[PDB]
Point group: C5
Chain length 265, copies 5
């Protein structure tokens, strides 16, 4: 990539610069730039650790959707094995919540998936709100509440599936917070500029003791910094459509297929 | 910030170090780079662990504000799933939940909550809330009376009361976590680490000038920037409930919460 | 592995040889630049290994929860329905089937024999037909206590106490499927650590001469031993040395539940 | 903060090293700085990790005291929300909950809790609590009896009794967790060898620097020693979180805050 | 202290090193500090991460045993508060709860729980516990039957049965956790690598140091090696938390504390 190509030529410039720039006293020893490189590597490791934690919290939150939606459908079959109208409808809302969450995080438009799973009557209320995924939850709770006032659910077994709508609410909230949070941007931008300036200004610090071999031993260590710095660029925002990013769309079909299998479809 | 000035000190110090260089060899004073390499590496390790503790303190603060929104969403949702017809209780409870959020904001920011309280609640409750050592505690007490009176009237069983009571429990744990991060910021985690990061940076050009005849200023400023950049980020993370640009945007988060709760109750 | 150590011992020897021309060709491969590169690689190896250990530790805990949850579900059936041993043995068979199925699911092998050894062939087909057979097994564990509730021998309360244990086992199922399915981070380190070990003696040749190959191999031992432990801790459901003994764990589970039903 | 002592000893070792350096090489005794940077960086790594473990102990202690306030605040809230008219019982339980906080504090500080018990509770139960060898735990059971008597009198249902029983379980986890944190010198050697090891490195450091610095040895040596000593000292401070240092837990503040909260919270 | 073998051996290596370095100049062998610093710094980072794992695992073991004391305290509290008249049931459930602690100590120490079981329970129930291949787990089942018998006799409702049942769940995560920790060491590879790499590094160190320290090599090579060995040893003093060594957990003392707590709450 560009960065190391720039470094190899910049390394080339440093060799020519050293010889033809001898008159000015540009003595640049290796010891100071070693203290600097060790320092910013300590910071990159700590930063990349913080980014990686953010990525697996995202991955955990989505793991909880599949768990929570499997157990509420199983509770539904176990507690009310006859009410397939309630099961068809509730599975619709559970599946739509997943796709709505996915389109929300991807800042893309959920209408194709929501008509596919819901009557456009309801699909009109959901998109009329600024919080469409939250209202899908509130509607799924309404189906469960209906069963309670009909005397089909007691308060006890109502509460046990109420607790699964709680697990899903914490997913909704946490995902929004992860999307919304901008704390990583300040640290990383200072590190990114610092990492870059350090690599390009580095052959001028090696050329005194390395001569021609400067390009080789400079393009190498530039690779190991840019690569490890770029790694945090991938985990900082994990809801991206990138192959590196969570396969959010594979995960929603798994959700839909599984909730379809459990409902005798 | 204070980082631009401390950068300018370092430059001046490099110039002082070059002139100090002529007197340095006869003076019998030699400052090699190797002892400062060791000191600089140890300082970087300590700042690494420190920033990590500051970032976690910051992450938890926004996590705690994350579940105000979550707990209040589901409490409003339970109210409508269990008592779909009690819109009076829906509205009073929502006004308490909205008041809890704004008063929590005022509590962490050490500012006056009466205006926000007077917009959302009747005046006799505002006096009740402000007489309390913990006004946001008193608000959870009042919301609890709403669900508690619905229970007395027989419109809530003990089961469905407990379900909503749990959400007021979650709000209390949010309340105590925020109070805890405010009253528990360690001193030497910034006493040492800014005095020594400061003193290390001003002393560095002197240790560097023997090896770099005129480049002492440039490389010394690069090193000082990265130590001061990394060090000050931890104090931009040290007051997550503060009011700087990198602190939590708690006003916007209170508007988000209230707009969320109003949207759920048809307003 | 050992091939790589032997190659470093050679590659040191090529540096041994190629040193005769360092002066005439103009080479100054000095040590301090490689001393900085190795220290940074160690920092990233330490962090990557620590993240690899966490996935392994979390995988270990998920499987611990299977044994804990299935134990106390069986405790509850005995404490609450002590004379219902037709139901005890049916539910226990699904629980044992659950843990073997998850082993096969994470290992990508055939559960049919295990399912047949433990369940009637009628339900072995229902399980072998679902998208997630482990998921179906829990569904069928839930109809057993579900029916006891409409048999009226479980109240909604005591039903829910055992329902909670099935929620616990679903969290394990999702936890494992998330770790089994969840490149650069390694790919960066996998490529970089190797190239540093082959180039190091050429920069070491300069002061170690003949004792170049053994410090070069000593250093490379420390680095490669650490990097490969991360790759096997990364795949905790694999078959490597320090991978989870899943077969032993399912047997422990089985002879635990076959100890609590009479 | 006896850092000043081994700072002033460090200056001494520096001047012996200076005057005795010339004498010192009488047969080939030589101390370079490179072995002392390998050793010093290693010691720095182990200090960061140790300090990170000590900080975690501090954060857990604060979290445990946090939920004392949270659990006690919601327990008395549930009492007023569920039984608004039974204030004879609110006063009895509030004083047990307040006595639990103070009794917990005296137990961790190894101080006499009699004055705070005789001020909150009737003397017949004060002697029952002092007779027991686990007094804080006996306060919990006593608070539990109050809830239990309200349940045998039909004023509480099993469900509503259950919601409050939960909060007593929260306090039971606090007590045990606090007791485990107090009794954990465990491997005190981990900081005990490190305290000495850091001490020997800082005494020997000027002898390893005089060849490079000469007269500037005591300045660079005290700076390196200060950095290492203070970070070590912060750790020995953090890992005794119930101690009496300033960086420790304001236990007094929290006990008074919850008493005021509970009092202001009922009249 | 397998440490003085490696520490004292370091002194012998240092003397062999001085004579050896003048010969090394003649031979073609030559050792510098800087390569070993790269080694030593790499080892210390790895030593630091391993020891953090070893420490976390020791902390989890101490946590789990603390839960035994917490959960049995509240189980006893609930019983008195909910069934204050039921002293016979109080005493029976307390003995199982005490028996579980001791039986968990014995099993983690692979020692014989028979004498303790017979001091606390009727022999007819000691036989049942010892017949099982998982005795401590069976102690939980018997305690659950005491609670369950109270539920069927109508003295406990399903609600208050469940409040107590949740506490036996707490004890079941302790038992699982301890069994897991008792069988899952911090990887053999981790400690093996670090055992041999610190060893080899400690013996070959005085060689690389001899050119810089002349006659001072042993007084510094033993100081450096001592740091790396004491820090690798601490991971081997946190590996065996259920053993009987001084820095292991005082499980016997922790078990006595639990017993006298529960007798304190039941008058006995
Ligand atoms: Zn769940
Ligand atoms: Zn159906
Ligand atoms: Zn919640
Ligand atoms: Zn309404
Ligand atoms: Zn010059
Ligand atoms: Zn459990
Ligand atoms: Zn049976
Ligand atoms: Zn000498
Ligand atoms: Zn709580
Ligand atoms: Zn009152
Ligand atoms: Zn508990
Ligand atoms: Zn009794």
């Amino acid at each position: 990539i560009f960065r190391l190509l720039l470094n190899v030529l910049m390394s080339i410039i440093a060799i020519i610069s050293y010889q033809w720039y001898e008159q000015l006293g540009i003595h640049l020893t290796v010891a100071p730039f070693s203290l600097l490189g060790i320092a910013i590597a300590i910071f990159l490791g700590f930063r990349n650790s913080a980014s990686y934690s953010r990525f697996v919290e995202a991955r955990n939150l989505w793991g909880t959707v599949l768990i929570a939606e499997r157990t509420l459908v199983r509770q539904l079959r176990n507690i009310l094995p006859a009410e397939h109208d309630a099961h068809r409808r509730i599975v619709s809302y559970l599946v739509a919540f997943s796709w709505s969450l996915k389109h929300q995080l991807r800042k893309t438009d959920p209408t194709a998936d929501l008509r596919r799973l819901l009557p456009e009557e309801r699909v009109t209320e959901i998109l009329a709100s600024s919080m469409p995924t939250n209202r899908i939850l509130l509607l799924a709770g309404n189906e469960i509440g209906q069963l309670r006032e009909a005397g089909k659910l007691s308060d006890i077994t109502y509460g046990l599936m109420d607790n699964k709508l709680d697990e899903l609410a914490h997913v909704l909230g946490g995902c929004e917070r992860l999307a919304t949070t901008p704390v990583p941007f300040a640290a990383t931008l200072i590190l990114q500029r610092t990492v870059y300036l350090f690599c390009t200004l580095l052959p001028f610090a090696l050329v005194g003791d390395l001569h021609y071999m400067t390009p080789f031993v400079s393009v190498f260590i530039s690779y190991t910094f840019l690569s490890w710095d770029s790694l945090a660029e991938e985990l900082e925002d994990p809801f991206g459509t990138a192959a590196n990013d969570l396969p959010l769309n594979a995960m929603c079909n798994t959700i839909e297929r599984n909730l379809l299998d459990m409902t005798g479809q």
